[PDB]
Amino acid sequence: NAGTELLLQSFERRFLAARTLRSFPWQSLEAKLRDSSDSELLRDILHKTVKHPVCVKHPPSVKYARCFLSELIKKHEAVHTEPLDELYEALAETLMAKESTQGHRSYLLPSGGSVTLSESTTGLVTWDAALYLAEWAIENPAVFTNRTVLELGSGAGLTGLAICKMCRPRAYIFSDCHSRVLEQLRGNVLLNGLSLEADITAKLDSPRVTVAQLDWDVATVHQLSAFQPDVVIAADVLYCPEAYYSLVGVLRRLAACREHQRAPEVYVAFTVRNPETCQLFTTYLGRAGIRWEVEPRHEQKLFPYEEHLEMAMLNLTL
Numbered sequence: 001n002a003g004t005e006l007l008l009q010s011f012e013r014r015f016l017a018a019r020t021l022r023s024f025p026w027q028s029l030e031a032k033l034r035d036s037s038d039s040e041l042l043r044d045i046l047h048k049t050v051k052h053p054v055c056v057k058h059p060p061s062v063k064y065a066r067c068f069l070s071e072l073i074k075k076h077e078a079v080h081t082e083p084l085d086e087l088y089e090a091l092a093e094t095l096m097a098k099e100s101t102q103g104h105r106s107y108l109l110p111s112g113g114s115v116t117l118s119e120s121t122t123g124l125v126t127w128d129a130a131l132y133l134a135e136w137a138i139e140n141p142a143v144f145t146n147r148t149v150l151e152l153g154s155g156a157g158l159t160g161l162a163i164c165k166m167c168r169p170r171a172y173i174f175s176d177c178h179s180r181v182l183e184q185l186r187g188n189v190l191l192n193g194l195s196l197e198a199d200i201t202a203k204l205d206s207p208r209v210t211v212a213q214l215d216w217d218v219a220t221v222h223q224l225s226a227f228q229p230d231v232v233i234a235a236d237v238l239y240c241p242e243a244y245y246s247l248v249g250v251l252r253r254l255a256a257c258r259e260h261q262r263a264p265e266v267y268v269a270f271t272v273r274n275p276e277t278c279q280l281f282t283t284y285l286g287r288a289g290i291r292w293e294v295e296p297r298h299e300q301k302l303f304p305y306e307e308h309l310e311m312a313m314l315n316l317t318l
């Protein structure tokens, strides 16, 4: 019984997150369909995916839906041909009507809510390290509760939206330098029901959410002072070795910004796509006077990661 529930959770989370088709656990479904002639498992998969309420409100790209339903029909055809009307009617609905419009990826939260993002086809995508950092923030809510959080390179804003909906920060500052990324970020913040600080904030439960432009290369000590962060986080921001120096300079300025009172806690998570990345970043941090420790690997529970590469996260003392 436990295997079936875990399989259903896997299918739900992987379809909602629009993960790659090859990542779906088709072999466990094959075994379960071979052991039972009951199409109710396929029906439960149907209701937890294409007919899931969060999908119904924010559907993914129609291509994804039709490929998924075609492969699910193909897996249904191998076992006893008890025709399930719901699968074919749903595929009819997907195919018969509408256009591609825009895509959506949704991520479920422990509170029963969800984070819905309208990321499109490199900052316009939700990288895995964002999922990793969001999970870590969910399992360590004391770091952010009623705190001021500044994210460097928010991208689509998955991590920040998850933190705003799970850890109750006092204020959250999404920061990026690319204009289209910031536009999609504001659209995603409004899509998830969060009102910006410029707008009149209501009831003080809503965190003061701001989407500020913050280019790492020219960010001044005054501009960074203006934010007054208690925590600074970044995820998958180590794309090129040259940007290491820009990011380290930004952290340097951030510490220097408020010489009076202490420096904020800095957490940098990244996908280890090249060990040279981590080694070079650590050497630069040591040369700049920032101390660093490796945070322990946390069990990956909620979110389905795209590539399952080795994840890492550094706690930096400024």
Ligand SMILES: Nc1ncnc2c1ncn2[C@@H]1O[C@H](CSCC[C@H](N)C(=O)O)[C@@H](O)[C@H]1O
Residues within 6 Å of the ligand: 122, 123, 124, 125, 126, 127, 128, 129, 130, 131, 152, 153, 154, 155, 156, 157, 158, 175, 176, 177, 178, 181, 214, 215, 216, 217, 234, 235, 236, 237, 243, 246
């Ligand atoms: N020099 C710079 N200054 C400010 N932001 C930068 C930057 N260089 C890259 N970025 C931003 O950093 C992001 C890295 S992609 C990571 C996005 C997000 N953290 C996620 O994991 O989904 C991009 O969105 C890009 O816009």
